[PDB]
């Protein structure tokens, strides 16, 4: 059906979306984009400790 | 009576040995391991223990060092603090049960409140903010570094993935024509 | 990549059923004509046993490999919660005994305000 | 039924043979790999030390939605991992406020018996 | 009875932006494998 259509299911962009001063749900929103955060970074160290290297042996 | 690079010695372990007695008396909570000052807060917590609370204040801003640092004359302790600690321990199967009772509360306490969150918001996302600043730019170095290194090797990667599409494309015309 | 007998890279790669692992050509055929043996387990293994269809495929990238990664995200966050939950069963344990020395030292606080102001009390008196 | 790191039902149990706890293959191993210990009780112990120890198939509903279910699910891990840290983080600030008071009420005691050392003298007087 | 992959530096993504052109390329492959 999806692919007759030729439409996609949509995703949550809901955290690129939050903003400041708002209710308790968006309070929920900001705490997620720190654990985000978290994991983006602990995920970029990871590649940086790797290096290139890993990209040359594939 | 001829000493000889023993009163140095000497000097050096009776200095090792006043350091130990400062270095163990100087705090309790200090020593083991981990405070804004306010003296605000010392004056708004007066109406508490309301003894207690204003000698563990005062405390807690001398160790610490709108700060003002007034008495080190506290902290010779080492032999008072030593029988203190022993008339105390004497005044202290059942003891243990109410410890732990009392624990299963406080726990309870502790997942009541943070329950019931999840003033308070502004410093939230002002922390994200402070992490969106320090993370992003960051992850905008670690990307941009990774990105002048593994773009030219991604290339290096993805035109040598269109290799094998054609290499399959024309596997199948020869294999047919086989 | 590598032939597990001599440590070059084939050029000819026959992989063998007996024990998976990727053999040169020219050198696992004279490892045969030796001994009929495969080189590793030490099974036999016959030239004939030893061998070099239409789905097209492509190339490792970041759906299985995606699904296999999200495994790693979480079995990596599922340590992250050990390392809190076993702290926090050394802090409250702490924190009992604390509050218990402390509950049981006030009581003794209580009884010196008591007994050094009442001997104040009763000598200023006489 | 739970392993006793992530609380998962194990899909590949293995137990510990210097404590008793039934661990799951990949996240003792990664303890493993990291230090040579065991998690619950810091025994030294290692990975051929392991002895590899009720399946029932989740059917969901009556495949888009599937997807927002997905996505509402890794929202809220990572919220009831997040709460748990500030918690743990509060609890040993609020266990430290505590241990300064426990130490500046011991030194509190050393004056009040002065007085009363003081006053048992004027009492013999 | 090891192959490596280098994920991208952008890796959020792989919840929304990876997970969906995956199931579009499937989607989208098989129907027009089946037109073929």
Same mark, same amino acid.
């Given at each position: 059906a999806l692919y007759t259509e030729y439409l996609k299911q949509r995703n949550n962009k809901k955290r690129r979306t939050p903003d400041f001063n708002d209710d308790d749900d968006t309070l929920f929103l900001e705490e997620y984009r720190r654990k985000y955060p978290r994991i983006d970074t602990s995920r970029y160290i990871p590649n940086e400790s790797s290096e290139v290297s890993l990209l040359g042996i594939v | 009576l001829t000493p000889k690079e023993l009163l140095p010695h000497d000097s050096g372990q009776e200095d090792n040995e006043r350091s130990n007695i400062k270095s163990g008396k100087q705090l309790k909570s200090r020593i083991r391991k981990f405070f804004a000052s306010l003296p605000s807060p010392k004056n708004d917590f007066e109406i508490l223990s309301e003894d207690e609370k204003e000698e563990d204040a005062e405390i807690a801003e001398y160790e610490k060092e709108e700060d003002n640092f007034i008495e +080190? +004359?506290?902290?010779?302790?080492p032999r008072v603090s030593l029988v203190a600690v022993p008339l105390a321990y004497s005044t202290l199967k059942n003891n243990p049960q109410s410890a732990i009772d009392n624990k299963y509360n406080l726990l309870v306490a502790n997942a009541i409140n943070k329950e019931p969150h999840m003033e308070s918001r502004m410093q939230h996302i002002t922390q994200g903010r402070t992490s969106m600043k320090i993370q992003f730019k960051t992850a905008m170095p670690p990307t941009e570094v990774l990105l002048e290194s593994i773009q030219s090797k991604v290339e290096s990667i993805e035109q040598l993935q269109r290799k094998l599409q054609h290499v399959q494309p024309l596997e199948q015309q020869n294999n047919e024509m086989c | 990549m590598l032939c597990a007998i001599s440590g070059k890279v084939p050029r000819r790669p026959v992989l063998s059923p007996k024990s998976r692992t990727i053999f040169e050509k020219s050198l696992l055929e004279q490892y045969v004509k030796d001994t009929?043996?495969?080189?590793?387990?030490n099974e036999p293994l016959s030239i004939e046993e030893i061998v070099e269809s239409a789905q097209q495929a492509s190339l490792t990238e970041s759906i299985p490999n995606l699904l296999t990664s999200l495994q790693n995200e979480w079995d990596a966050i599922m340590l992250e919660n050990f390392k809190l939950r076993s702290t926090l069963d050394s802090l409250t344990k702490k924190l009992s005994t604390v509050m218990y020395e402390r509950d049981a030292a006030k009581l003794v606080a209580a009884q010196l305000l008591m007994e050094k102001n009442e001997d104040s009390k009763d000598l200023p008196k006489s």
């Amino acid at each position: 059906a999806l692919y007759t259509e030729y439409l996609k299911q949509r995703n949550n962009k809901k955290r690129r979306t939050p903003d400041f001063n708002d209710d308790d749900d968006t309070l929920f929103l900001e705490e997620y984009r720190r654990k985000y955060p978290r994991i983006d970074t602990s995920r970029y160290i990871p590649n940086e400790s790797s290096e290139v290297s890993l990209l040359g042996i594939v | 009576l001829t000493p000889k690079e023993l009163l140095p010695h000497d000097s050096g372990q009776e200095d090792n040995e006043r350091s130990n007695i400062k270095s163990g008396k100087q705090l309790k909570s200090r020593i083991r391991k981990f405070f804004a000052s306010l003296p605000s807060p010392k004056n708004d917590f007066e109406i508490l223990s309301e003894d207690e609370k204003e000698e563990d204040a005062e405390i807690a801003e001398y160790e610490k060092e709108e700060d003002n640092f007034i008495e +080190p +004359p506290s902290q010779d302790a080492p032999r008072v603090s030593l029988v203190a600690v022993p008339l105390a321990y004497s005044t202290l199967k059942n003891n243990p049960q109410s410890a732990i009772d009392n624990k299963y509360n406080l726990l309870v306490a502790n997942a009541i409140n943070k329950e019931p969150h999840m003033e308070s918001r502004m410093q939230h996302i002002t922390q994200g903010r402070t992490s969106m600043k320090i993370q992003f730019k960051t992850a905008m170095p670690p990307t941009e570094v990774l990105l002048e290194s593994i773009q030219s090797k991604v290339e290096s990667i993805e035109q040598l993935q269109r290799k094998l599409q054609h290499v399959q494309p024309l596997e199948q015309q020869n294999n047919e024509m086989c | 990549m590598l032939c597990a007998i001599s440590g070059k890279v084939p050029r000819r790669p026959v992989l063998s059923p007996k024990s998976r692992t990727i053999f040169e050509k020219s050198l696992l055929e004279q490892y045969v004509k030796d001994t009929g043996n495969d080189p590793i387990t030490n099974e036999p293994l016959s030239i004939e046993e030893i061998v070099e269809s239409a789905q097209q495929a492509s190339l490792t990238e970041s759906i299985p490999n995606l699904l296999t990664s999200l495994q790693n995200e979480w079995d990596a966050i599922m340590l992250e919660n050990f390392k809190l939950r076993s702290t926090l069963d050394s802090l409250t344990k702490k924190l009992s005994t604390v509050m218990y020395e402390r509950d049981a030292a006030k009581l003794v606080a209580a009884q010196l305000l008591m007994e050094k102001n009442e001997d104040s009390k009763d000598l200023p008196k006489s």
